[PDB]
From a paper:
Mpro is a cysteine protease that cleaves at no less than 11 sites on the replicase polyproteins. Then the mature Mpro forms a functional homodimer and transcleaves pp1a and pp1ab. Given its essential role in the viral life cycle and the absence of closely related homologs in the human genome, Mpro is considered an attractive target for anti-CoV drug development (12–14).
Further, we solved the structures of SARS-CoV-2 Mpro mutant (H41A) in complex with six cleavage substrates from replicase polyproteins. Substrate selectivity is revealed using structures of the H41A mutant in complex with six individual native cleavage substrates. Additionally, other subsites such as S3 and S2′ to S4′, which have less specificity for substrate recognition, may also be used to enhance inhibitor binding and to specifically target Mpro.
Residue numbers in the entry:
A (entry chain A), B (entry chain A): 1 to 306
C (entry chain C), D (entry chain C): 2 to 9
Amino acid sequence: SGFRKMAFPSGKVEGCMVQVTCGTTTLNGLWLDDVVYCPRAVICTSEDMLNPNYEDLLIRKSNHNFLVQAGNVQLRVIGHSMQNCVLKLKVDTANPKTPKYKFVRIQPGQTFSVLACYNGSPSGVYQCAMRPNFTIKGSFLNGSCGSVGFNIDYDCVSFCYMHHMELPTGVHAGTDLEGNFYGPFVDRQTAQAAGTDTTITVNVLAWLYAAVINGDRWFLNRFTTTLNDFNLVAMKYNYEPLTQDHVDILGPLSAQTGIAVLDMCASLKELLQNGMNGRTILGSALLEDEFTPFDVVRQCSGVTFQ
Amino acid sequence: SGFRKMAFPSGKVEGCMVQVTCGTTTLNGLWLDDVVYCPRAVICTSEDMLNPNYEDLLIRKSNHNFLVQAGNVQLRVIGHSMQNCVLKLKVDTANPKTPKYKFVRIQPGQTFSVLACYNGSPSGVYQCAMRPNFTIKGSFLNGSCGSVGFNIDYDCVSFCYMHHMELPTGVHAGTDLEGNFYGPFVDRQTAQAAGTDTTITVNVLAWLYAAVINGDRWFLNRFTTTLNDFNLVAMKYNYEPLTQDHVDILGPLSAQTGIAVLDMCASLKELLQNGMNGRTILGSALLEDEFTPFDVVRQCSGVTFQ
Amino acid sequence: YPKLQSSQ
Amino acid sequence: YPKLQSSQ
């Protein structure tokens, strides 16, 4: 029993973290086979941060302008190229710790683990969701640029996020590992702001199912709702529309608990309309939305505590 | 910016996890140098679980009754002994992945990372506190016995918890790595219950300081309190007494933010007496108590966002 | 009753 | 303004 905001074991990623310096600017890179991936902002200088032309900045660089440190050892850069907002530094040594890996671009609402790093050295691991407005609510300081987010499926690491920047609201924006930003953001310090965010409805429902699996049913009720009528309440409370696809995805959790998806929707509607009245669910006084249906199934038992 | 329930990177511990089987019972062990540490409950049989005599059960075993699997490879047990509630299985191979490590017995209120494991294979990592009643609110299923909790200081892993059992309230009980239980619990399935728990006051205060470092001051007030008067409110709300030692430990966070410790106590008193009135602090609608003052300093910036 | 969380 | 979180 119990239900925690659980991250994936980070060891396979720890072995891939390096330090990249260009000039007086240092950040983290990701060393897989003989390629180091890092944010192209490493070639920025502290005064050309408003509107750098990276193609222009990069053509003025040579392989030896990039200093890559893998803990003890310096790695020799033997080639470099830019792909969207990331640099690919070819090095002369294949990382002997390279895991089985993929690059994946995730959808908003999906979760991942973040290995926060400074100067190529991991500091901590935590679980994130990609928000519907394509920010993440991370924990990041200067030097964390290049830290990566990932999922592990069996022993394959699916990298899905590389960290670039902090927006003025204190939330975070970054790219896939091909350098394409999530959201409308760009890697320059001009005025940019996150769009209005919403709550991830399918995740809130998954977490209510987690609560039931863990022996807690106080929020349930005898009612049901139609999908349309639920979504009319969802919109009022700044929740994402729930789709038939979401209903389908919540299928396994519905079957394990015996609570129809639309019945759980009726519970959520009541929670949205009444609040919790000083009660908690799985240790939270708020409706939690950073657990996917897959996360719940992964962490919870196949028995439901009847 | 941001503030997350952050775990330590788990790689150094992942390399130490093995599987131990005796008879039809399997659980996890911890392989450091040529010794595997695991709960002595591995020598239990499913019917002698109420009141096993472990000294009696163990003297009836030989080295070859213990099957230790380190992923692919089986490890040969060449000696065994019992120390309190753990077994030490000497194996003929020193773990080549052994980190720098210590065994530490922690105080209630201290936090640690848990690497949850099944059949010697890590599944997830999360951050825990030792509760004042010497339970932890973990996330554990059958097979997780032997999973360990730890802190990392520089590159030294301080192991502080080995998981043994789930109490009827769904919270968890275990030992230090010398096999001594935290709390009054014993490794047998007779009636046992956690004592009444309390909230870790010094941690709640540290987390309020985290909130201020992260630019949020809404809960502050112009008042102060005496230590005695604060503790009289603390007792009423089932909070731990705050000591002068706690005040001292909160010194660095007080100095970084410019908020006297007893001034933050006045803020907490007001929050306890009034509630939050539909507001949140660092994304929580409850007062969070699983961050130590050290945790806050580690995760937060040295700048406070004035 | 408390459960020792080994597996069978 | 947004901050690219490299270090100097």
